[PDB]
Design a protein around this ligand. Structure first.
Ligand SMILES: [Mg+2]
Ligand SMILES: [Mg+2]
Ligand SMILES: [Mg+2]
Ligand SMILES: [Mg+2]
Ligand SMILES: [Mg+2]
Ligand SMILES: [Mg+2]
Ligand SMILES: [Mg+2]
Ligand SMILES: [Mg+2]
Ligand SMILES: [Mg+2]
Ligand SMILES: [Mg+2]
Ligand SMILES: [Mg+2]
Ligand SMILES: [Mg+2]
Ligand SMILES: [Mg+2]
Ligand SMILES: [Mg+2]
Ligand SMILES: [Mg+2]
Ligand SMILES: [Mg+2]
Ligand SMILES: [Mg+2]
Ligand SMILES: [Mg+2]
Ligand SMILES: [Mg+2]
Ligand SMILES: [Mg+2]
Ligand SMILES: [Mg+2]
Ligand SMILES: [Mg+2]
Ligand SMILES: [Mg+2]
Ligand SMILES: [Mg+2]
Ligand SMILES: [Mg+2]
Ligand SMILES: [Mg+2]
Ligand SMILES: [Mg+2]
Ligand SMILES: [Mg+2]
Ligand SMILES: [Mg+2]
Lengths: 50, 77
RNA sequence: GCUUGACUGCGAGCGUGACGGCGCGAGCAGGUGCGAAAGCAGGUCAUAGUGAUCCGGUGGUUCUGAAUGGAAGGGCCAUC
RNA sequence: UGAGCCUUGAUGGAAGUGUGGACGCCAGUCUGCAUGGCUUUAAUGUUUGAUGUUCUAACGUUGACCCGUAAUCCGGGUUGCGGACAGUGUCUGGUGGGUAGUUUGACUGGGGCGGUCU
RNA sequence: GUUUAUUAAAAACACAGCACUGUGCAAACACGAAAGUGGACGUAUACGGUGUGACGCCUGCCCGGUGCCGGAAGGUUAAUU
RNA sequence: UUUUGUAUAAUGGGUCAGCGACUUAUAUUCUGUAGCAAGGUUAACCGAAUAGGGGAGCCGAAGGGAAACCGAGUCUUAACUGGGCGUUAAGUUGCAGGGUAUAGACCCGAAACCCGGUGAUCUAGCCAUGGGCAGGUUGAAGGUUGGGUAACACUAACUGGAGGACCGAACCGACUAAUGUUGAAAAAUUAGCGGAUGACUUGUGGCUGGGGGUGAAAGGCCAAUCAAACCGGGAGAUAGCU
RNA sequence: AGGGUGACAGCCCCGUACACAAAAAUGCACAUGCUGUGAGCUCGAUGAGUAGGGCGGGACACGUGGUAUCCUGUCUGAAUA
RNA sequence: UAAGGUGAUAUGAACCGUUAUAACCGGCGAUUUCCGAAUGGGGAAACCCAGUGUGUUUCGACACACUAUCAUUAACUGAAUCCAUAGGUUAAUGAGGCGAACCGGGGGAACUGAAACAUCUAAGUACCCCGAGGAAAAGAAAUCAACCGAGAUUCCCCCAG
């Protein structure tokens, strides 16, 4: 579970970076509350051309 | 039933096998948990009965394409 | 006293067992020991001192080696 | 707080007023403290665990309320409590006559007991 | 009072009483792969289990063994790594 | 029949008639017989269907060695003067047959184990709802009223009507004996016997199911069945026994 | 062929050999109408919680054996002509 | 198709037919009570009772049609909560039950054999459950081979006890 960010976010926050988080933190908080999206290789250029 | 809605995993039969190699019928059943997913795509919460892995699939494939199957396949949800 | 014949490969032919097997054996081949030498020595005066097969261990072995070279595993010999 | 590497530790403007440590068999009157033309000793960044705190946002709720609904099921919703504990899956050590399948020799002046078995 | 319907009615079983013990409630426990249900629409003056067996006077010594309760130190010790 | 041995007082048969136990398939070897012979023969299949084709294959004319390998020899050992096994004797395919193997394998026969169903119209316990207990005794608590005390306590009459209380029918039970034992009856009859306002008794319906129920506990009971019900199935379980 | 007929029938009867038969309704071939479906060429594309692994089992004649190969309940996890 | 018929035990009565509507045989229609998947609710199978519609020169009450459940689809309605989903209604389609074996799959014995018995055997058999067809299944190589080659699946005889 890698994912790319939206708003800031704690000890990784950077508005469109490739951070690596624990699956739980992801699919329970980060995603559900609109703060990130998985590195499904589609999305890796939506927030990588910034 | 103890069936994972996304992978279709259900209990299988096997043996136990003691040191003396005695066979005893048993079951390996899947790791269900029934987890509340956030879809956003429907501004709703979906509780699925899910195997771990099932969860790892939803993480990979993405809920939306998973829920695309199921409906395509028949499941309520 | 000196020694390693309590040697290795074989064995005419006998004994004794339902069988598995056990036992006695001159002699031949190689190499060894004692003796001046003829000779004696294949454990102990003899008859108890023992445990089949399977499974596997150790060493040796060009015997085998699942496409080929290998290797694993197997076989054969010694032994546990 | 356990452990490598990068490192915050040193590897093959001179001389002055000069005063705590050093594992140093059994204490170097030397340096600053203001000043003068890619390591044993540990700790900052970590990737990685152990423990403890607190959090909520998974998970539990056999508290309350709301709707489906004139319904003590169920579901959803809000909240309260609980909380990464519990519980469950796989794996695993213990326990396990609760349950289950079986074994528990022969000879023999009947059988058992004794004795015997090469 | 109960019991071997169909050879045993008793001294056997039950019993009120007594004691140990488990049990804080989603109780222990039991039926059940589960949901659930009984326990109880009860809550430690309750409920389960065990033994004893009205009542009277009483109920001594032993914790080595086995079991149960408690034991953060050490030795042995699983999957894993 | 079984036995060392049976007139045996050891087994079996009342009698007759009818049925009633070494089979079948496929493998394999031997003997007989037949065809062909250092050769014999095909299988599935084709099929003009018992023919004809089909030689895939199998057996044999070469063995020795674990084997590589060598080959009328080979193995053994550095090597045999040797020793082991071979060389010298016909084979193969049908057909009938004597054995064997796999099969229920001569026939009948268990007690049992597993699987799926059927049973709480008997009986055990529970649930809900209805019913029954002639007649006769004893006289608890309480009350009232007199005596009694400072008042209580106490006491006497009376009233009152408790109880797995008392006697005894219905009703529920089953302690003794006789009868019965091819019964009137697969547990009864007769005369005695226990309880009879209770943990009593009773009608109807409901619920619990087989290693399971239920059990005031006897291993009792769950349809004349119970140390694991009945019915069907694995099933021709297995039977060194008769 | 066979059956029957007052006992055994080629020539008594029903048949048998042989030869014909469908107004309807249908099984099956082709052929078309209708309905839906796509054919053709060019340039593309090439099956990931998968393969592989650890733990447990199970399938393969093959009993974990030195045991390849297949399946997966569990925890993981690639390359990509 | 016909000279004879009104099925049978089974006579008789009363009849029908003989040149094409007697009867007999075949195709397609018709009617087809009640129960049974049973389907309007209920129920001790062959019975009990409803809703809404129709229906009567005797337009009462009774008779007849429809009214199960689930699925897909459509329309309209429509909570906590505004949207929205849930829910609710209706409409059209489809399923349901049954059946000898063969077939695929989910589950899966024990006797027994081993001369006892646990590994092993019986055996993925017996049985239970789901499902399908006229057959099912399997099938167009991430297959074999052995440096020569072969070319999906299926069945048969060999290979070979
Ligand atoms: Mg036992
Ligand atoms: Mg047994
Ligand atoms: Mg004996
Ligand atoms: Mg009494
Ligand atoms: Mg009795
Ligand atoms: Mg007693
Ligand atoms: Mg107590
Ligand atoms: Mg005798
Ligand atoms: Mg005799
Ligand atoms: Mg005589
Ligand atoms: Mg006698
Ligand atoms: Mg006699
Ligand atoms: Mg022929
Ligand atoms: Mg009853
Ligand atoms: Mg009875
Ligand atoms: Mg009384
Ligand atoms: Mg009395
Ligand atoms: Mg009695
Ligand atoms: Mg008397
Ligand atoms: Mg009497
Ligand atoms: Mg007893
Ligand atoms: Mg038998
Ligand atoms: Mg059998
Ligand atoms: Mg491909
Ligand atoms: Mg009806
Ligand atoms: Mg109905
Ligand atoms: Mg046996
Ligand atoms: Mg297919
Ligand atoms: Mg090629």
């Amino acid at each position: 579970m890698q994912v790319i960010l939206l708003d800031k976010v704690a000890n990784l926050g950077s508005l469109g970076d490739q951070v690596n988080v624990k699956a739980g933190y992801a699919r329970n908080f980060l995603v559900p509350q609109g703060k990130a999206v998985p590195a499904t290789k589609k999305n890796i250029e939506f927030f990588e051309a910034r | 039933s103890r069936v994972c809605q996304v992978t279709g995993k259900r209990p299988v039969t096997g043996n136990n096998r003691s040191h003396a190699l005695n066979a005893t019928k048993r079951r390996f059943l899947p790791n269900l948990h029934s987890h509340r997913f956030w879809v956003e795509s429907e501004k709703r919460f979906v509780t699925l009965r899910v195997s771990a892995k099932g969860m790892r699939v939803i993480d990979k494939k993405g809920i939306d394409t998973v829920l695309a199957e199921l409906r395509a396949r028949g499941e309520k949800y």
